Amino acid sequence: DPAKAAFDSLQASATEMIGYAWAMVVVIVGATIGIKLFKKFTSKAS
Amino acid sequence: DPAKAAFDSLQASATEMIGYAWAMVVVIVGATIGIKLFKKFTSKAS
Amino acid sequence: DPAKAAFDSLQASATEMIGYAWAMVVVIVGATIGIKLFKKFTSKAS
Amino acid sequence: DPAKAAFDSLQASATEMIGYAWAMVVVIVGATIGIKLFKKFTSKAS
Amino acid sequence: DPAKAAFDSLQASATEMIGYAWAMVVVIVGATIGIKLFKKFTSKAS
Amino acid sequence: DPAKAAFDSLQASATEMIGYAWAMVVVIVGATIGIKLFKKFTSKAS
Amino acid sequence: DPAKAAFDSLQASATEMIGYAWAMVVVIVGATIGIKLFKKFTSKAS
Amino acid sequence: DPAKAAFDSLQASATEMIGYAWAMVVVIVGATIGIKLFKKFTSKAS
Amino acid sequence: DPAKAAFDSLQASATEMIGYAWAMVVVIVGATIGIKLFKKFTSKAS
Amino acid sequence: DPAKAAFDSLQASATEMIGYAWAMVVVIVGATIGIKLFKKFTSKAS
Amino acid sequence: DPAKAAFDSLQASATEMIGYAWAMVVVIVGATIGIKLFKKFTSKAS
Amino acid sequence: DPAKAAFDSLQASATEMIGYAWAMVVVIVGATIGIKLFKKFTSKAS
Amino acid sequence: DPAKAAFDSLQASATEMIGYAWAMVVVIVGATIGIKLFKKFTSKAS
Amino acid sequence: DPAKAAFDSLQASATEMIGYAWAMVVVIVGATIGIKLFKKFTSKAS
Amino acid sequence: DPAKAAFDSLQASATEMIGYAWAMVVVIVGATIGIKLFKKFTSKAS
C-alpha cells in the first residue's frame, strides 16, 4: 500500500520540525522573561 | 455483481486513510497548543 | 415487450449503486467535519 | 432518507466535543484567575 | 408533465435539509459564544 | 408549416422550467445568506 | 422579474437580524460599563 | 442583427441588479460600523 | 471566390460581438471593485 | 484599446473614495484625541 | 509563421496591462499606509 | 482466445503506470506539506 | 517515407511554440509575485 | 517502454524545481522573522 | 532550462525589495523609540 508508507514519512518529518521549533521558543522566551525580571528586581532593590 | 465488491474495497481503503490522518492531526495540534500554553503561563507566572 | 423489462432492471441496478454511494459519503464527510471541529474547539478552549 | 440519519450522527458528535471543550476551559481559566488573585491579595495584605 | 413533479420533489428535499442545517448551526454557535462570554466576564469580575 | 408550431411548443416548455428553477434558487440562496449573517452578527454583538 | 422580489426579501431578513443584534449589544455593553464604574467609584469614595 | 438586441437586454438586467446590490451593502455596512463605534466611544467616555 | 467573401463577413460579425462583450465586462467589474473598496476603506477609516 | 479606458475609470473612482475616507478619519481621530487630552489635563490641573 | 506574430502581440498587450496595474496598486497602498501611520503617530504624540 | 491475452497485457501496463504515478505524488506532496509546516512553526516559535 | 518527414516538421513547430509560451509565463508570473511581495513587505515595514 | 523513461524525466524536473522553491522560501521567511524580532526586542529593551 | 532562469530572476527581485523594507523599518522604529525615551527621561529628570 503506497499510502501507508507515504503518511509514515510525512509524520516523521513533522515530528522533526516540531523538535526544532521547541528549541527556538526556549531561547526567545528565555530572553523575554530574563529582561522582565531584571527590570523588576532592580527597581525593587534600589 | 462486480459493483458491490468494488464499492466495498473503496470504502475500506478510505477508512484506513482516515485512520492515518487522525494520527497526524493529533501530533501537530498537540504541539501548537503546547507552545501556546507555555508562552501564556510563563508570562503570568513571572 | 422486451423494452419494459430491460428498463426495470436498469433502474433497479441504479437504485442499488445510489445506496452504496450514500454509505461512502457519510464516512468521508464524517471525518472532514470531525477534524474541522477538533481544530476549532481546541483553539477556543485553550 | 439517508440524509436525515447522517445529520443526526454529525450533530451527536458535535455535542460530545463541546462537552470535552468545556472541561478544558474550566481548568485553564481556573488557574489564570487563581494566580491573578494570589498576586493581588498578597500585595494588599502585606 | 414529468418535469413539474420532479422539481417539486427536489424543492421539498432541499427544504428539509435546510431545516437540519439550522439545528446544527444553533448548537455550534451557542457554544462558541458561550465560551467567549465566560472568558470575558470572569476576567472583568476578578 | 410543422416547424413553426414545434418551435413554439419547445419555447413554452423552456419558459416553464425557467420558472421552476427561479423558485429553487431563491430558497437555497435564502438559507446560505441567512446562516452567513447569523454567524457574523452574533460575533460582533457579543 | 424574479430577481427584484428575491433581493427585497433578503434585504428584509437582514434588517430584522440587525434589530436582534442591537438588542444583545446593549445588554452586554451595559454590564461591562456597569462593572467598570462600580470598581472606579468605590475606590475613589473610600 | 439578433445579437445586438440580446446584448443590450443582458446589459440592462445587469445594471438593475447592481442597483439592488448597492442598497443591501449600505444597510449591512451601516450596522457593522455602527456597532463598532458604539463599543469604542462608550469605553473611552467612561 | 465565394470563400473569401464569406470569411470576411464572419470576421466582421465577430469583431462587433467582441465590442459588445467589452462594454458588459466594464460594467460588472466596475461594481465588483467598487463594493470591495467601499468595504475596505470604511473599515480602515473608522 | 478598451482596457486603457477601463483602468483609467477604475483609478478615478478609487481616488474619489480615498478622499471620502480621509474626511471620516479626521473626525473620528479628532474626537479620540480630544477626550484623551481633556481627561489628562483636568487631572494635572486639579 | 502566423503563430510567431500572434504571440508577440499578446505579449505586448500583457506588458501594457501590467503597467496600468502597477499604477493603481501604488495609489491604493499609498492611502492604506498613510492612514495607518496617521493613527499611530497621533496616539504616540499625545 | 486472442481477446483474453490482450486484456491481460493492457491490465499489466496499467498496473505499472499506476506505480510510477504514486512515486511522483509522494515527492510533490512531500514538498507542499514541508513548506506549509515550515511557515507555520517558524511563526509560532518566534 | 512521407510520414517520417511530416512528424519531424510537426515536432519542430511544437518545440517553437513551447518557447514562446515560456516567455509569456515568465512575464505574467513576474508581475503577480511582484505585487504580492510589495503588499506584504509594505505592511510589515510600517 | 516509452512510458518508463518519460515518467523518470518528469520526476527529475520536479525534483529540481522543488530545490529552487526551498531557496526562495528561506530568503523571504528569513526577512519576515527578522523584522518581527527587531520590532519586539527594541520595544522590550527600551 | 527556462525554469532555472525564471526562479533566479524572481529571487533577485525579492532580495531587492527586502532591502527597501529594512530602510523603512529603521526610520519608523527610530521615531517610535525616540519619542518613548523623550517622554520617560523628561519625567524622571524633573
Author numbering:
A (entry chain BBB), B (entry chain BaB), C (entry chain BbB), D (entry chain AAA), E (entry chain AaA), F (entry chain AbA), ...: 5 to 50
What text appears in the publication on this structure?
Most extensively studied in this group are the F-specific filamentous phages (Ffs) that include viruses f1, fd and M13. Ffs are also strikingly simple—their single-stranded DNA genome encodes just 11 proteins, of which 5 form the phage capsid. pVIII is the major capsid protein that forms the filamentous body of the phage. The tips of the filament are formed of the minor capsid proteins which occur in pairs. pIII and pVI form the leading end of the infecting phage, which interacts with the host receptors to initiate entry, whereas pVII and pIX form the trailing end11,12.
pVIII forms the main body of the filamentous phage. It is produced initially with a signal sequence that is cleaved to leave a single α-helix of 50 residues in length, with thousands of these helices packing together in a helical array to coat the length of the phage DNA genome. The α-helices are slightly curved; with their C-termini projecting into the phage lumen, resulting in an overall highly positive charge. The N-terminus of pVIII is splayed outwards towards the exterior of the capsid. In our map, density is smeared for the four N-terminal residues, indicating that these are flexible. The helical parameters were determined using cryoSPARC and were refined to a helical twist of 37.44° and a helical rise of 16.6 Å. In the filamentous section, pVIII interacts with its neighbours by mainly hydrophobic interactions, with hydrogen bonds observed at the C-termini and mostly involving lysine residues. The positively charged lumen of the virion is comprised mainly of lysine residues from the C-terminal ends of pVIII molecules, hence allowing them to interact with the negatively charged DNA molecule. Four lysine residues from each pVIII monomer (Lys 40, 43, 44 and 48) line the DNA cavity. Overlaying a protomer of our f1-derived nanorod pVIII with a previously determined fd phage pVIII structure (2C0W; determined by X-ray fibre diffraction) shows that the two are broadly similar (RMSD of 1.0 Å across 39 pruned pairs; RMSD of 1.5 Å across all 46 pairs).
